[PDB]
């Protein structure tokens, strides 16, 4: 489980996302489709190509999600269940995806936060990351 | 794969014993009923609700007997088990866009129903064995997504 | 989540395996060892080789301890607790190992049960397994 | 592993501007930080109970140097690694008894260092050619286990 440091942290280094959680959203996934093709397979509805409006769109859908988590950081499994239920039931995404997207969610993160990824930080968005995957697969079967 | 001769022979040994028609589409069940998120490949097929809507169902059943027997080219050439799905795989990956996890769960799923359907016969050394050719089989599959 | 369903099914069919416990538990960890090499890296101090002593001795352990758990399926993180710290803070055994040991434990069920492995309580007992991983990995950090 | 001209060129750019000094040692750390488990093998370093008393224990700054060593020799020799790595796959196994998993878990947090160290230069298609790489790398290591 997370702890009252790793609450923080994440808060810490969110704040710092700020506007940018959507072109941060959309660049994860970009790092997601290359670097880890067969995730493709859920998007064949979409130009996956680089600066494409879908994944621009998609990616803040995605990030917003994770602002309205990191929030409720003390309650997401209400604060996401809808989306639980949607990934579960609708679209029925293999829950190994999720360790895939949450590795690039990172990458991108510390891309971006040069004083504010330190291996502390780094840790807390793990563990993070780890609890949102496992919230939104709960309702899998 | 790279399978000892003497593993080689304990798979297709096992194998010749092996009911097309019974065991392929139980595979696919269990696949489904255990892991119902793969049951997006197969919203045509019909009643796809409880165990029996789904091992029932004719259309899963049928489909099981296609991927046993396309399994079966496989051990035929398990010297080059790429070159024998590399048609299969861009079909799963362009046309019918098939995330090649579940490749790796009806794997698993298989070598259970091999073990329930054959018992003690199913020993550890045997396991082992098939558990190498449906693991090589399972990166064929999945060798040409991109 | 487990389910009165899922918990039927499991109290079912594990009471079915009734005094095998030490014996299907040895063959589960054997047939581990064989088809997964990589596993053996946490008993070198052992004798994995067939019918050891210590195999037949631990394949009980953790055949009693899965007994344990079914007998307070409502309450697992507590009956667990135990063996939770040991794996986290002593063993340090890498989460991936779990659904390696928990898909042998099924394969063995499945070659001793014929009649009661139904696709069913097949889906039911991955589950429960899946359950018990998941509170024996929950002290990891 | 096969890489295509322009990720074999990415990756050697950006690795001959590498301080291994630097990211050796941030990489273990982390690693230790991070993947708490794996401290299972350095009991002998030291002081471990927090980020920083990991992050300034001198017994790993130095051997994290000597991971990234051996990377950076790998990556010299990207149409060999298994043979590069040989005598290192063995090591682990045999005598280090090292789970293989840890491989890729050391992988996934070196490309989080890269992307931490270089920033906007770690472009997302760069990423994909080093999981590529830290993929390779990993498998070479594992390849001799039994
Ligand atoms: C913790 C990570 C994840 C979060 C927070 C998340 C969030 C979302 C959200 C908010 C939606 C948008 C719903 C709407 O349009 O109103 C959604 C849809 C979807 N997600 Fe996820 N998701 C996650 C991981 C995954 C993964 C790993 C995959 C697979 C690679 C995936 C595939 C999809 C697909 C295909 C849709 C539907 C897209 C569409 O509307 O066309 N999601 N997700
Ligand atoms: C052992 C692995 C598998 C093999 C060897 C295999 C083999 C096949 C074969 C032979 C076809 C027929 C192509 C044709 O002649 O038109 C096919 C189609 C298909 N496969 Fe697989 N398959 C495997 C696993 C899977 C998995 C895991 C899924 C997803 C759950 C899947 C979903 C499909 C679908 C949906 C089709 C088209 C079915 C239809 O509409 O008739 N396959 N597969
Ligand atoms: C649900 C699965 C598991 C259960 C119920 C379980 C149960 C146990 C129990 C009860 C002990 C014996 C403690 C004693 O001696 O009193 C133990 C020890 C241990 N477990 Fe597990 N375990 C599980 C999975 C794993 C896995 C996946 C691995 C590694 C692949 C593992 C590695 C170990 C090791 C090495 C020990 C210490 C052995 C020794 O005493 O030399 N366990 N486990
Ligand atoms: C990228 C993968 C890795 C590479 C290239 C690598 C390379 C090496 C090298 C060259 C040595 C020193 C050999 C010697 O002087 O005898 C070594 C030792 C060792 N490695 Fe690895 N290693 C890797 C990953 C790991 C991981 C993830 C672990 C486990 C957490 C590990 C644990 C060890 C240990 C414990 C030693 C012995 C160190 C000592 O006691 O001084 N290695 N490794």
Redesign the interface.
């Known amino acids: 489980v997370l702890s009252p440091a790793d609450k923080t942290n994440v808060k810490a280094a969110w704040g710092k996302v700020g506007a940018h959680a959507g072109e941060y959203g959309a660049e994860a996934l970009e790092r997601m489709f290359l670097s880890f ?3 493709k ?2 998007f ?1 509805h979409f130009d996956l190509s680089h600066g494409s409006a879908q994944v621009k769109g998609h990616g803040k859908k995605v990030a917003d999600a994770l602002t309205n988590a990191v929030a409720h950081v003390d309650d997401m499994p209400n604060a996401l269940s809808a989306l639980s239920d949607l990934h ?1 039931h609708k679209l ?6 999720f360790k895939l997207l949450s590795h690039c969610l990172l990458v991108t993160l510390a891309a971006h936060l040069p004083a504010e990824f330190t291996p502390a930080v780094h840790a807390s968005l793990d563990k993070f990351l780890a609890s949102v995957s496992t919230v939104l697969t709960s309702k ?2 | 794969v790279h399978l000892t001769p003497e593993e080689k022979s304990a798979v297709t040994a096992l194998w010749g014993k092996v009911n097309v028609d019974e065991v392929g589409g139980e595979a696919l ?2 696949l489904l ?8 490949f197969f919203e045509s097929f019909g009643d796809l609700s409880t ?1 029996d809507a ?2 029932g169902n004719p259309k899963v059943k049928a489909h099981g007997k296609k991927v046993l027997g396309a399994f079966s080219d496989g051990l035929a050439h398990l010297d080059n088990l790429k070159g024998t799905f590399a048609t299969l795989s861009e079909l799963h ?1 362009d046309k019918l ?6 490749f790796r769960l009806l794997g ?1 799923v298989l ?3 091999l ?2 359907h ?3 016969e ?1 020993t ?2 045997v ?2 064995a098939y ?1 190498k050719v449906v693991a090589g089989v399972a990166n064929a599959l ?1 060798h040409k ?2």
């Open positions: 093709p067969t995730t397979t859920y064949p579960a029925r995404v293999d829950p190994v995806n899998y079967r | 069940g269990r009923v255990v892991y119902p998120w793969t049951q997006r165990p789904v091992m990956c866009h098939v995330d090649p996890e579940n698993n070598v259970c129903v073990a329930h054959f018992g003690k199913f550890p050394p396991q082992a558990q999945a997504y991109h």
